[PDB]
Structure formats: structure tokens, C-alpha cells
Design a protein around this ligand. Structure first.
Ligand SMILES: CNS(=O)(=O)c1cccc(C)c1F
Ligand SMILES: [Cl-]
Ligand SMILES: [Zn+2]
Ligand SMILES: [Zn+2]
Length: 573
């Protein structure tokens, strides 16, 4: 309690000694309130919208551009038998992830380049590029760093703003990255290294990965989402995640222990309240970390929870109230004998999972999952999970996957989602102050992603070609999974590299010579997934596409353009 968060709290009060008021009407029950002080949207991409006119009248698209009680909740302490299961599983899982990896500190150098190459670090000097080029900031970091080496914290404070992001100042983010960045930077949750993980795999790999699991003898495929995963992270989960420090040494060990002890297991947050007074609250549970460390620790704790749910379905342990000495031996023998095989039966991305268990007893194995506080979304606490019998219907990372056979018999496994969602996201730009050129380059990034991932959707291949015809040929795609669409190289060359050359599920490496040789979903399958084909508006839009292309060209001005439309059969002369 206050010994660990006091200094942070004291520093904030003193800097607002002319507003501090211990309001006794504070809405917090689960968050400790300490005091208060006085304080005080999504834009449309016009290039994408002008080239997607039929969607101007589709509410699912247009509503996406318009525009709690979860955070203020407490998860009960797991039973003793649950706690033992979690500790034994976490210990074994860090050892497996560590067999072929070395924990190491990340560098100012690595962090500096990251800020220059742009990446969502969630930080609060105008920008962060300037601070990185200011030795005063690094002296600030140094002070905090020596504070952390002494088991104390001064400036590592969260800011609150199914989604609530916790931003810290760049300095606090550096110290987090220094200590724990290795998890992401060195690919600890890669499929090679973790067996269940998919970190760095790419959307053109996830479908093949789900298909390989399918191959494994067993029951249905289960894909239960957790209700607000970050809010259900227990202090017991935070302490099992901290055991990664047991694989560390010297300074690094001490710096990592301090991030876990001082910023994760004992948080401090500023939240704006309109009644506007900045509220200084604290708690010892729930997920609070950078988005990227959040991803790796979410993947770890999800892998642990799913391997236990698999042990419950196999009857490795009878009761979660207490674990017999014999049951502990059985759990350990299970992990040593089949742990790796059981991790290979899952695909886990943060709080998202697909499990192909040994059989369907998994569906009603719910005691350990519920008691860890990982309560399933949109189903009764004790109702058995509904599994999937077809890998092409399993939801994962907001997608499903189709098996598509090319005219030459080679097999593509392609990512897919409702096309209204794809068009509605491409029509939105984050932040404002965008020039026409910057807006066009963001439209081109979406168009190139569509050509690479969603080429099998008739409307997206046409709109992608239209956008790439409407934006100057040499303008570079921008943005504010691996992103092979972020390039000025020809998209047919990238397609061949991604789907043929570098694709380990494709034995025959014969290049594709034109877009013609790249297939679509069946017409009915296209419609089922939101294609507008068969509609008067869509056909007029395809027939008159050169007119829409010319409207956008006229707005951008006299630039060098390419006509990509003759890459499609119909638009050839
Ligand atoms: C322009 N839309 S369309 O002419 O209706 C159409 C385009 C592509 C495929 C089909 C089956 C179709 F009906
Ligand atoms: Cl099914
Ligand atoms: Zn600190
Ligand atoms: Zn689909």
C-alpha cells in the first residue's frame, strides 16, 4: 500500500497544492481514492469514401464513422488448489519459453529508432521524437532508474482515457521497454518458440495455422472469448507473470522486478471526471502496462489458463479447492510428458484463443476457468461451451478463413471478415491535421492491404485497383501481424513473395504471372460475406469506375498516375 505509491501520490499533490480536495462523493468502490485537483474523434478518409460510393447507403459502414462499470470491478481470490495449478503451470511455461531464448535489456538506441519509425507506445517536448533528442529527458530517466534500483518509484503514473487505454510518460515507457521489451523484440510468443503463440505470424499465416491444428485428432475446436480479459487479471496472475524475472540476472533482474512490484502489482492512475477534477486512485490488480507488454503477458496467462482447462477435461485433477500431493505429481508429469503436444493444439493471440482438445470433455470443464476469474462472454457461467466442427467457421483475431483452390490446383488459405467491417475501417482516419497527400497515402495502405489479404473478395479487389489508380503511382503508403503491404514495390511481386515464395505450406514455387491467375471466393460465398454483387448500385459503380478514379485524380491534381483497372478481366480493352 502507501509505502510503495506514497512518493508518487505526494509528488502529484505538491505540484497541485492550489486545488487538492479529498472529495467524499467519489464514485470509486474497488479503486482506492487518495485525492483530487482541478484540470480541463474519428474523421472520414475522403479518398476511400469517394471510391466506395455504393457503401454510402449501408448503415453498417456509415455508422462506424459516427460517435465504465467494467474497470470499477474486483475479481475474487482463487481457491488454494487453483493457485497451486497456476504456479506449477506458470513455472513450467517460463522454463519452456526460456529454453531457446535469453532475457536481455532493450536499449535507448532501440527505443529511439522505434519512436522515429512510428509505433503506438501510448505516451503523453511537443512530441516524443523531440524528447529522445534531449539529454535532459534521459537524465530524468536515470533519476527514476536509480529510484527503481532502490525499490522506489516517483513518476511511473498511468492515465485513463471494452476499451480503456493507460498512457504513461515516455520515460516510464522506456523503463518498461528496457526491462520487458525482449518478450516482443525477441519473439518469445512466436509459434516456433511458444507452440501456441502466433506473434509475428501475419494474417496470411493464421488460416494455415488453424488448419494444421484441425489435422490433430481430438474433439471440436473451442473459441471462447473472456468477458473484459484485462479487468479479470488477478494479483495471482501478476505474480505468476513476474516469475519471468527468475530467468534474469544482475541489473536486468532488478529493473524487471521493480516494473512488476512498483508499476504492475501496485498501480497509480489519474482519471478525469466531468463533475473536471483529475482523480488520483490506486489498485493492486487488473492489467496495467504498455499495449505491447500487455500482449505478451496476456498470451502467457491465456496459454496457462487454457493448458489447465485441458488438464481439467482430461481429469488430471478432481477439485480446485485443494490439490493432493499425488495430484501435484500428476500435473507435473502431465506437463513434462504432454505439455508441448497440448500447447501445439492451441492458437493464442493475447486474450484470444482457439483450442482443439483431446476430446469434448473440455466443453464442460469450467471450475478452474471460472475460479481463475476468466469468465466466458455471452454464455451462462455453468453452461458447456459450444465448439466448432469446421476450422473454416472458427473465429480468431476478428477473422475466419476460407480454403481457396487456384486454377493450377495449389491451395490458398485466406483471411476473411464481413466486408462492411473492412470498408467501414478503411473510411476512417485517426487524428486530424491530415493533408490531402497524407489522406491519399493512408487510402493506398488500405488498398494494398486489400490486394494482399482480401484479393478473393470481388468488391475489395476492384476498389483496391481503383484507389491505387486514383493515388499517384510513386506516393508511399502511410499509417499513424507483419505489414508487407507497406511498400512501393509492385503488389503482384509482393503477392508472389507472400503467398508462393515464403509460404511454407506451398511445395510448388511457380510464380503467378498476372492477377487473372489469382482466384476469388465462390460468388455465393462472396455475398454471404457482405459482397454487394448482384446489386444495381454495385454494377453501375464497377461500370463507371474510371469516372470515380478521374474525380479523385482531379482533386489531387496533375501528378503521375497508373491505370491498374486492366489487371482485371472485364476492364481490359
Ligand atoms: C458489377 N456487379 S455485377 O455486374 O452484378 C457482378 C459483378 C461480378 C460478379 C457477379 C456475379 C456480378 F453479378
Ligand atoms: Cl461448425
Ligand atoms: Zn517509477
Ligand atoms: Zn468469409
Amino acid at each position: 500500500n502507501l509505502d510503495i505509491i506514497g512518493k508518487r501520490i505526494e509528488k502529484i499533490k505538491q505540484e497541485h497544492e492550489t486545488s487538492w480536495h479529498y472529495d467524499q462523493d467519489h464514485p470509486y468502490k474497488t479503486w482506492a481514492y487518495h485525492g483530487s485537483y482541478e484540470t480541463k474523434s474519428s474523421m472520414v478518409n475522403g479518398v476511400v469514401r469517394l471510391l466506395t460510393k455504393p457503401w454510402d447507403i449501408i448503415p453498417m459502414v456509415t455508422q462506424m464513422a459516427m460517435t465504465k462499470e467494467k474497470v470499477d470491478t474486483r475479481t475474487q481470490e482463487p481457491k488454494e488448489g487453483t493457485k497451486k495449478l497456476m504456479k506449477i503451470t506458470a513455472e513450467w511455461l517460463w522454463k519452456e519459453l526460456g529454453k531457446k531464448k535469453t532475457p536481455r535489456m532493450c536499449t535507448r538506441e532501440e527505443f529511439t529508432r522505434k519512436v522515429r519509425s512510428n509505433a503506438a507506445l501510448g505516451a503523453i517536448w511537443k512530441s516524443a521524437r523531440e524528447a529522445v533528442e534531449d539529454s535532459g529527458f534521459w537524465e530524468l530517466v536515470d533519476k527514476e532508474r536509480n529510484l527503481h534500483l532502490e525499490g522506489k518509484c516517483e513518476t511511473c503514473v498511468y492515465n485513463m482515457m471494452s476499451r480503456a487505454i493507460w498512457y504513461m510518460w515516455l520515460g516510464a515507457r522506456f523503463l518498461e521497454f528496457e526491462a520487458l521489451g525482449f518478450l516482443n523484440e525477441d519473439h518469445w510468443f512466436s509459434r516456433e518458440n511458444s507452440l501456441s503463440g502466433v506473434e509475428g505470424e501475419g494474417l496470411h499465416k493464421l488460416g494455415y495455422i488453424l488448419r494444421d491444428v484441425s489435422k490433430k485428432e481430438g474433439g471440436a475446436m473451442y473459441a471462447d472469448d473472456t468477458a473484459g480479459w484485462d479487468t479479470r487479471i488477478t494479483l495471482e496472475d501478476l505474480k505468476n507473470e513476474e516469475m519471468v524475472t527468475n530467468h534474469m540476472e544482475g541489473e536486468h533482474k532488478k529493473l524487471a522486478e521493480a516494473i512488476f512490484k512498483l508499476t504492475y502489482q501496485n498501480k497509480v492512475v489519474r482519471v478525469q471526471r466531468p463533475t473536471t477534477v483529475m482523480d488520483i486512485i490506486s489498485r493492486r490488480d487488473q492489467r496495467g502496462s504498455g499495449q505491447v507488454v500487455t500482449y505478451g503477458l496476456n498470451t502467457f496467462t491465456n496459454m496457462e489458463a487454457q493448458l489447465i482447462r485441458q488438464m481439467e477435461g482430461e481429469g488430471v485433477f478432481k477439485s480446485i479447492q485443494h490439490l493432493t500431493v499425488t495430484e501435484e505429481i500428476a500435473v507435473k508429469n502431465w506437463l513434462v510428458r504432454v505439455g508441448r503436444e497440448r500447447l501445439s493444439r492451441m492458437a493464442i493471440s493475447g486474450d484470444d484463443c482457439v483450442v482443439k482438445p483431446l476430446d469434448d470433455r473440455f466443453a464442460s470443464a469450467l471450475t478452474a476457468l471460472n475460479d481463475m476469474g476468466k469468465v466466458r462472454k455471452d454464455i451462462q457461467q455453468w453452461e458447456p461451451s459450444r465448439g466448432w466442427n469446421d476450422w473454416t467457421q472458427v473465429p480468431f483475431c476478428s477473422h475466419h478463413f476460407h480454403e481457396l483452390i487456384m486454377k493450377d490446383g495449389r491451395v490458398l488459405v485466406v483471411p476473411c471478415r464481413n466486408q462492411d467491417e473492412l470498408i467501414g475501417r478503411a473510411r476512417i482516419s485517426q487524428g486530424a491535421g491530415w493533408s490531402l497527400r497524407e489522406t491519399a497515402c493512408l487510402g493506398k495502405s488500405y488498398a494494398q492491404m486489400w490486394s494482399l489479404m482480401y484479393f478473393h473478395r470481388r468488391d475489395l479487389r476492384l476498389a483496391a485497383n481503383a484507389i491505387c489508380s486514383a493515388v499517384p503511382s510513386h506516393w508511399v503508403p502511410t499509417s499513424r501481424a507483419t505489414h508487407e503491404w507497406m511498400t512501393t514495390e509492385d503488389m503482384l511481386t509482393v503477392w508472389n513473395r507472400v503467398w508462393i515464395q515464403e509460404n511454407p505450406w506451398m511445395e510448388d514455387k511457380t510464380p503467378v504471372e498476372s492477377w487473372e491467375e489469382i482466384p476469388y471466393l465462390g460468388k455465393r460465398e462472396d455475398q454471404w460475406c457482405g459482397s454487394l454483387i448482384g446489386l444495381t448500385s454495385r454494377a453501375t459503380w464497377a461500370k463507371n469506375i474510371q469516372t470515380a478514379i478521374n474525380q479523385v485524380r482531379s482533386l489531387i491534381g496533375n501528378e503521375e498516375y497508373t491505370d491498374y483497372m486492366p489487371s482485371m478481366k472485364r476492364f481490359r480493352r
